[PDB]
Amino acid sequence: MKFCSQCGGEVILRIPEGDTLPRYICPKCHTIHYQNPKVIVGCIPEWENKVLLCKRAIAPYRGKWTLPAGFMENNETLVQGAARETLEEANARVEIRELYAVYSLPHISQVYMLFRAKLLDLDFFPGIESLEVRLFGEQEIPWNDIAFRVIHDPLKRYMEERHHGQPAFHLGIINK
Template sequence: MRQEGDDRDRLTCRDCGYIAYENPKVVVGSVVTVGDGVMLCRRAIEPRAGFWTLPAGYLEMHETVEEGARREAWEEAQARIALDGILAVYSIARLGQVQVLFRARLAEPGFAAGPESLEVRIFTWEEIPWQEIAFPSVRWALKAWRDGAGHPGPAVLNPPEDLRGARPLLGPVLAGDAG
């Protein structure tokens, strides 16, 4: 039902008028560097079980984006991380997501697969299994990290070829990703 003065239909209770707003979910995560490599987690859960991703997931209520990124690194990689600033903010309109990804490093030694990961590994740029990356935004974040040489700078946004995050999951590897 469309409310007066609104530009879109909303789920609205006909009896009491309550409006159930549907808003994007916030995803938080990190490109965690260890030496010359980056940490990737092989997903144990759907979607894209068996594929590699960054330690990331949905922000919880009453949590800052920084707290959420650190929690996700612990849940997925049993890693305590230190955040070094925002790397990227991506709008994934087709999924109703906003992704906030940080530059990070280990705050203390050690990592291991958490309950949502089959394994956790550190990959140099040349070793990254590009054909087994779970989501386009993981490719984008890795490329943004590499392009910034891992150093703090302004956060990047969606790449020009996918401004709304609308491309399908199984698109080709972005030019320049593998080398």
């Protein structure tokens, strides 16, 4: 961050009194500019015993597979965000069900929230961020070609736990 969004002055890194870490502050308007982590919302679209994955079109990891997911926007709920991201990436209509996974990615100041979801029809197809979209049985999922560990781990757990009953919600951490 180079400039102040409120007045256009150049910002500088200072540790406020009582704190131990720097914040960008603006000496022209005398205000502190806080940075906060970002939420990524998405879901596991289920159809019969299959799940919908998307092959990414945009780096990083083009050609690798993932779940519909992306940055939450302002003026929406978590559920609204997950359904919107699914429609945008996969042209797919889902009903969002239980929150399944919450992951902290502290190194990149991200939080992933992954919901269970019911695919409502098969009339789906790639949006611009996707090369392709399709349903996979558990034995079809290309585990080695999943883009992100934050997607790979909860998905594998989900598929495996649901042989035994309704997968239990869990909280994860992926470090650098």
